[PDB]
Scaffold this active site. Structure first.
Site, mmCIF file in Angstrom:
data_model
loop_
_atom_site.group_PDB
_atom_site.id
_atom_site.type_symbol
_atom_site.label_atom_id
_atom_site.label_comp_id
_atom_site.label_asym_id
_atom_site.label_seq_id
_atom_site.Cartn_x
_atom_site.Cartn_y
_atom_site.Cartn_z
ATOM 1 N N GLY A 12 2.709 -5.227 -1.188
ATOM 2 C CA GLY A 12 2.947 -4.259 -0.106
ATOM 3 C C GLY A 12 2.633 -4.913 1.245
ATOM 4 O O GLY A 12 2.255 -6.113 1.251
ATOM 5 N N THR A 13 2.823 -4.189 2.343
ATOM 6 C CA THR A 13 2.877 -4.786 3.699
ATOM 7 C C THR A 13 1.583 -4.431 4.466
ATOM 8 O O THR A 13 0.786 -3.496 4.141
ATOM 9 C CB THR A 13 4.064 -4.529 4.579
ATOM 10 N N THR A 14 1.262 -5.291 5.548
ATOM 11 C CA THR A 14 0.064 -5.249 6.419
ATOM 12 C C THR A 14 -0.091 -3.815 6.989
ATOM 13 O O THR A 14 0.716 -3.273 7.700
ATOM 14 C CB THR A 14 0.182 -6.157 7.540
ATOM 15 N N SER B 11 -0.570 1.219 1.558
ATOM 16 C CA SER B 11 0.251 0.020 1.332
ATOM 17 C C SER B 11 0.283 -0.230 -0.170
ATOM 18 O O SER B 11 -0.672 0.173 -0.847
ATOM 19 C CB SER B 11 -0.455 -1.126 2.066
ATOM 20 N N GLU C 213 2.910 -2.304 9.479
ATOM 21 C CA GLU C 213 4.118 -3.015 9.521
ATOM 22 C C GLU C 213 5.092 -2.386 8.481
ATOM 23 O O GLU C 213 4.729 -2.153 7.316
ATOM 24 C CB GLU C 213 3.862 -4.393 9.082
#
Lengths: 52, 196, 232, 244, 245, 111, 229
Positions: free
Chosen positions: E31-33, E76, E48
């Site tokens: 998953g993303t920041t 996330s 993000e």
């Protein structure tokens, strides 16, 4: 693709140019690569929605 | 039985009549109606005795959990749980409960619960069957942020009046002082306050 | 291994589910359809597949409501259950709140529904994508539903088999068809060109065309036969 | 070895052993903390390590000593998910008991019921053992200072003093030396402050590691109240020892 | 591995742990920041959200969701799974508001969420979650930020970070403690969040991003949660752009 | 006690022609000896060439009419847009009346 | 089965060209005993809507918490759930209505008299009645309880019908609301010298005014009479 190693990746691309050659084309396209994958697998490329 | 809770500068004092009446038999002449649900939250009971005893105990199951897990409950928070029980027993029970408590971010607070499931913030409260005779009297002598002594003198007198005028009010005037100081029980006997 | 492929409650070592991944394969095997929209109009154009020529086709458009509707790609049983659940929600919204529920707000409920069968032991996962359209006060919207159940708001998309050439078409003409507002003919036109490109072993006919349109002045209407004779 | 066995808690081995349960006695050292609970003659002290290994966390929130009820503290060694989960049952059973029976729940009765409930979780195979050691401390309203340690299988026994965590063996040894040498079963001070100080000293001895107020958290059950000392309250104690 | 342990999620290995929960975490890595920056007068959330292709609509999909009107949350990992935990949080939050007539304390929310995750490891007709969730807000006792692991572990956080580029993200947070020992104002912690996420996009460099920032602040949002948008957001963009180059 | 059924009067009238049909009715709505509204619809289109009016006590009636309007939506939906006839509608209302038979409704219905 | 316990009095409203005014006493009577003075009875929902509730006070509180949950429900998701998809009064209206039918259906109603007033996000005035018995009608001149019969004519001289709403201006509406307030103080035992008035205008929003005092007191025909005796 997912879980295709180096060898396999080359197998689909080379395979996809053969497929294209039979159709009447003399260059590869996006759709033809997709067709290369359906040799590795035993999936039917084109089948009507009544189980898929 | 007349009960009350009145704010002042340093906190809130809850007052009550401790008489318990079944008909014209007095069930017990004494015995509190000032019932803790917490160290800094206490409650006043009037109406039906049974109803009022049981409902408070349920509330203490809820606020035991509340304190343990999720911090101190506020006077609002304890009142909102009474309010739900009385709401859901609007047609099954009748309980007249004054909720007052002492805070470290509000000081003394008063929220009274009528016989139905409402919630009504006031800075002073009167309720029961004995209260309906001292409404005009308490109103004159209420003022904001009294000294502790004046508050006490004011509650003593007002409750004596309810005994004078109503048979279900009586016995000792108990008071529960809730302050930053702690918790003081206060008791007074009839001989002194009959005069006053 | 693919011994994590035996359950729906068991994540693989890389943190994937194989169940949700095989369901993506089922979209690919499902019939192609293109969504796109403009500020004031939204369209699905879908390829209506028959099993043979004694077979009189199959509807790929299910009317959800008078301001909503969906199309399909992948499993037909699966599209049917989730259409029933989605229709109930539109009725519900209209019964209880007097309101055309927002497409996107609608789509979070269908997403959960999917994930119910992902969480649980039993419950078949869903291996269909649905393209959702609607027109509320906040204009046209287009959602792309995944067999994961994820919801993606786009100006334009295509799914199904050979649907990638329709995404390359739309990307180029992206800004063109948005600016056209108050002109349904052009948006309709665009969805036909997209799905021309898809074709293999097929030629468009009158009865391969099903166009579903909702807009600024249009009910959810599905167009067929002599009314797609102006767009064959 | 393994042939079914360890995949279940309703499967015994040739030996009659339930293996999965033993894995939770290995799962409770997974926080790496160590605890010490000791008895005086008007208090029980319970002390656990405070690890704040990233300064990206708030050192305040960190703790594993939880207030269960007025008169009951508890230290948790082992996982954070199972810490909260065991605290939920404990908080709840303590409140329910209070209201059912009208009166407070002793250290022993809280310890007893938590274990039974755990046992039923080993009897059935839709549940699992919560892999935590819970050590309840209270000064009883009838039996004075008490420590009951509850193990993940659901055994319970009382104690004079106890230690838990991976580095338990060294603490066991220290504490044996202490009571043996006195020939009495408790610390002799009647000031609870020096007992907390004394508990601290033992803890430094046993581990070999000097401490700081960022590496301790201290719970103190006295008769009729409980309190967890803040960081500056601990701090005061350490400077009594270092220069007596 | 096999033999339970990774095939069932209530079965324990000799290691005293469960390897499926590590796998739950691995999906978070993928998953993303997302960051949350605790402040002394608020809390800031940034995320993000990657752009797969440019057919996507701008600022119309997020991972920022609200509970009540004062608790922000962002998750996330696996996106539809992460939606459902927040949704389950709402149903819980609603119950608190019914019974107690008051917003939820952020430490009250942290306890209830951690019970829900922990339950999905007690049964085997259930799947675990595979998401972390940074959350928090402002209440009575001020601002609080918590972050929940798919492990069902939480602790207070002066900075929380998750997703792939979190290595860069954690280091920048610790610098933020050192440079300002109050953790800076919530206004400038929005800008500070934009500089973080752009550096985190050097780990995600192959595609484009969309920066969505939200806040909930004691007097800069007047104790309520709102999206950070418009000239506030445009600022963040500009500060961030300046400072990578 | 709570009597859940009030009254709100009104008069509607139906005439069947032989190629047309009227449903008429007054807009005066009352509660006791007050006139509430100077304009109150009473005959509501429901489509398929059906207007429905269910008049007497107005709450019970809106509710009856509304449940039937949901019934049109589901009828198109599951029948692949089959139009609902006046006789099929009549019977359909009978099912709504029998489904609130022991919670009886107190409206004279004219379609 | 809910019986009248603690009760209020009357909520009074009308419509004018650009908005609506809704206003109410502040009272909480048990019996005839005025137990509570100064009980707030107008509850804003967003700022496009005020729902005013008199009838049983315990049930005002239940619905209070439902309207609070209405905004929370709306506030979840979408950056466009607040100004294009702000709570229209029509939606608010229906939610109350559905819950009355069902509660009524359980021989356990929420005992209330309800007037929902507000301006849509389409710009169109909405003023509509709902109550414990589930009766629904739209009228431009609405009042509840006693004032439904009693103080409803005054507002009707102003607004006769549906085409008289444009002919009325904010000033005429606002004063008409005051003249009627005097009637309710004077001649209903349920009285309070306090009242609140809320202006919802399309070009200003919600402007809430708390504790206005009634004035133009008339008691000098009381001086004029010696009565009989």
């Amino acid at each position: 693709t997912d879980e295709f190693n180096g060898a396999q990746l080359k197998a689909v691309t080379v395979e996809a140019g053969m497929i294209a050659l039979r159709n009447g084309q003399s260059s590869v396209k996006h759709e033809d690569f997709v067709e290369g994958i359906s040799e590795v697998q035993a999936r039917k490329s084109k089948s009507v929605s009544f189980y898929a | 039985t007349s009960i009350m809770a009145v704010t002042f500068k340093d906190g809130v004092i809850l007052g009550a009549d401790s008489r318990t009446t079944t008909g014209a038999y007095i069930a017990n002449r004494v015995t509190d109606k000032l019932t803790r649900v917490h160290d800094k939250i206490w409650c006043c009971r009037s109406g039906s005795a049974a109803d009022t005893q049981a409902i408070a105990d349920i509330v203490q199951y809820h606020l035991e959990l509340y304190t343990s897990q999720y911090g101190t409950p506020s006077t609002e928070t304890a009142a909102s749980v009474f309010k739900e029980l009385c709401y859901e027993n609007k047609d099954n029970l009748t309980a007249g409960i004054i909720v007052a408590g002492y805070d470290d971010k509000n000081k003394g607070e008063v929220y009274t619960i009528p016989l139905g499931g409402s919630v009504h913030k006031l800075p002073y409260a009167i309720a029961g069957s004995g209260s309906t005779f001292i409404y005009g009297y308490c109103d004159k002598n209420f003022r904001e942020n009294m000294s502790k002594e004046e508050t006490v003198d004011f509650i003593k007198h007002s409750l004596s009046q309810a005994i004078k005028w109503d048979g279900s009010s009586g016995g000792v005037i108990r008071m529960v002082v809730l302050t930053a100081a702690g918790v003081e029980r206060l008791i007074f006997y009839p001989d002194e306050y009959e005069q006053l | 291994r693919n011994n994590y492929d035996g359950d729906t409650v068991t994540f693989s070592p890389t943190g994937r589910l194989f169940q949700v991944e095989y369901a993506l394969e089922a979209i690919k095997q499902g019939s192609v359809t293109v969504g796109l929209r403009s500020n004031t109009h939204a369209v699905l154009v879908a390829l209506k597949r028959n099993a043979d020529e004694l077979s009189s086709y199959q509807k790929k458009i299910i009317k959800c409501d008078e301001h909503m509707g969906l199309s399909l790609a992948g499993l037909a049983p699966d599209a049917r259950v989730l259409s029933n659940y989605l229709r109930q929600q539109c009725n519900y919204s209209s019964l209880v709140f007097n309101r055309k529920l927002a497409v996107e707000r609608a789509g979070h409920l269908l997403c959960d529904k999917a994930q119910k069968n992902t969480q649980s032991y039993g419950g078949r996962p869903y291996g269909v994508g649905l393209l959702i359209i609607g027109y509320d006060k906040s204009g046209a919207h287009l959602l792309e539903f995944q067999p994961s159940g994820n919801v993606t708001e786009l100006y334009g998309t295509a799914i199904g088999a050979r649907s990638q050439g329709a995404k390359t078409y739309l990307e180029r003409t992206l800004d063109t068809f948005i600016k056209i507002d108050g002109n349904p003919d052009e948006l309709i036109k665009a969805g036909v060109e997209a799905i021309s490109q898809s074709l293999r072993d097929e030629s468009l006919t009158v009865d391969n065309l099903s166009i579903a349109i909702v807009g600024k002045d249009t009910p959810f209407t599905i167009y067929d036969g002599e009314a797609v004779a102006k767009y064959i | 070895s393994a042939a079914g066995y360890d995949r279940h808690i309703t499967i015994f081995s040739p030996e009659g052993r339930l293996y999965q349960v033993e894995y939770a006695f290995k799962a409770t050292n997974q926080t790496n903390i160590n605890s010490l609970a000791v008895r005086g003659k008007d208090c029980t002290v319970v002390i656990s390590q405070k690890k704040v290994p990233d300064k990206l966390l708030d050192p305040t929130t960190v703790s594993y000593i939880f207030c269960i009820s007025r008169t009951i503290g508890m230290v948790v060694n082992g996982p954070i998910p199972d810490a909260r989960n065991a605290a939920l049952r404990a908080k709840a059973e303590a409140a329910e008991f209070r209201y059912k029976y009208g009166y407070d729940m002793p250290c022993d009765v809280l310890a007893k019921r938590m274990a039974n409930l755990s046992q039923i979780y080993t009897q059935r195979a839709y549940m699992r053992p919560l892999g935590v050691i819970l050590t309840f401390v209270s000064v009883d309203e009838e039996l004075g200072p008490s420590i009951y340690k509850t193990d993940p299988a659901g055994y319970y026994v009382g104690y004079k003093a106890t230690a838990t965590g991976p580095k338990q063996q060294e603490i066991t040894t220290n504490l044996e030396n202490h009571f043996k040498k006195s020939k009495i079963d408790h610390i002799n001070e009647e000031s609870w402050e020096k007992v907390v100080e004394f508990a601290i000293t033992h803890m430094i001895d046993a581990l070999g590691t000097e401490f700081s107020k960022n590496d301790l958290e201290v719970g103190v059950a006295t008769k009729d109240k409980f309190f967890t000392l803040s960081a500056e309250n601990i701090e005061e104690r350490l400077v009594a020892i270092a220069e007596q | 591995i096999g033999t339970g342990y990774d095939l069932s999620n209530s079965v324990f290995s000799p290691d005293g742990r469960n390897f499926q929960v590590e796998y739950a975490v691995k999906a978070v890595e993928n998953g993303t920041t997302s960051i949350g920056i605790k402040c002394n007068d608020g809390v800031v959330f940034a995320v993000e959200k990657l752009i797969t292709s440019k057919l996507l609509v701008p600022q119309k999909n997020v991972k920022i969701q609200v509970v009540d009107r004062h608790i922000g949350c962002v998750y996330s990992g696996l996106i539809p799974d992460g939606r459902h935990l927040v949704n389950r949080g709402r149903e819980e939050a609603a119950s608190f508001k019914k019974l107690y007539k008051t917003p939820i304390p952020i430490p009250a929310f942290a306890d209830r969420l951690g019970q829900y995750v922990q339950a999905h490891t007690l049964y085997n007709s259930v799947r675990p979650f595979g998401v972390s969730t940074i959350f928090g807000g402002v209440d009575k006792n001020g601002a609080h930020l918590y972050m929940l692991e798919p492990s069902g572990s939480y602790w207070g956080y002066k900075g929380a970070a998750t997703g792939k580029g979190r290595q860069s993200a954690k280091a920048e947070l610790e610098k933020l403690v050192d440079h300002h020992p109050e953790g800076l104002s919530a206004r400038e912690a929005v800008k500070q969040a934009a500089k973080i996420i752009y550096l985190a996009h050097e780990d995600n460099k192959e595609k484009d991003f969309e920066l969505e920032i939200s806040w909930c602040s004691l007097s800069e949002t007047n104790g309520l949660h709102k999206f950070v948008k418009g000239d506030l957001l445009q600022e963040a963009i500009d500060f961030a752009q300046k400072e990578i180059n | 006690q709570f009597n859940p059924y009030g009254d709100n009067g009104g008069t509607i009238l139906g005439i069947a022609g032989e190629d047309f049909a009227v449903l008429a009715g007054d807009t005066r709505n009352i509660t006791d000896y007050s006139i509430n509204s100077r304009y109150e619809p009473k005959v509501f289109d429901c489509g398929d060439n059906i207007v429905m009016s269910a008049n007497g006590f107005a709450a019970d009636g809106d509710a009856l009419v509304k449940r039937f309007k949901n019934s049109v939506k589901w009828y198109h939906f599951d029948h692949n847009d089959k139009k609902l006839s006046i006789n099929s509608a009549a019977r359909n209302i009978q099912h709504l009346l029998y489904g609130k038979r022991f919670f009886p409704y107190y409206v004279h219905t004219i379609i | 089965t809910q019986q009248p316990i603690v009760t209020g009095t009357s909520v009074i409203s009308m419509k004018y060209d650009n908005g609506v005014i809704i206003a109410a006493d502040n009272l909480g009577s048990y019996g005839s005993l005025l137990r509570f003075n100064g009980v707030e009875r107008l509850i804003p929902v967003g700022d496009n809507t005020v729902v005013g509730i008199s009838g049983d006070i315990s049930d005002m509180q239940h619905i209070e918490r439902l309207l609070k949950d209405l905004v929370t429900e709306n506030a979840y998701d979408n950056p466009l759930a607040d100004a294009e998809e702000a709570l229209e009064p029509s939606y608010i209206f229906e939610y109350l209505a559905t819950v009355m039918y069902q509660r009524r259906s359980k021989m356990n109603p929420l005992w209330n008299a309800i007037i929902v007033a507000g301006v849509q996000s389409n710009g169109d005035q909405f003023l509509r009645y709902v109550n414990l018995l589930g009766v629904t009608y739209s009228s431009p001149t609405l009042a509840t309880g006693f004032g439904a019969h009693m103080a409803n004519p005054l507002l009707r001289k102003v607004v006769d019908r549906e085409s008289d709403i444009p002919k009325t201006t904010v000033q005429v509406a606002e004063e008409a609301i005051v003249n009627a307030m005097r009637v309710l103080y004077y001649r209903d035992a349920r009285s309070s010298r306090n009242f609140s008035l809320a202006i919802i205008d399309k070009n200003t929003g919600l402007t809430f005014k708390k504790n206005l005092q009634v004035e133009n007191m008339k008691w000098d025909f009381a001086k004029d009479i010696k009565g009989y005796g």
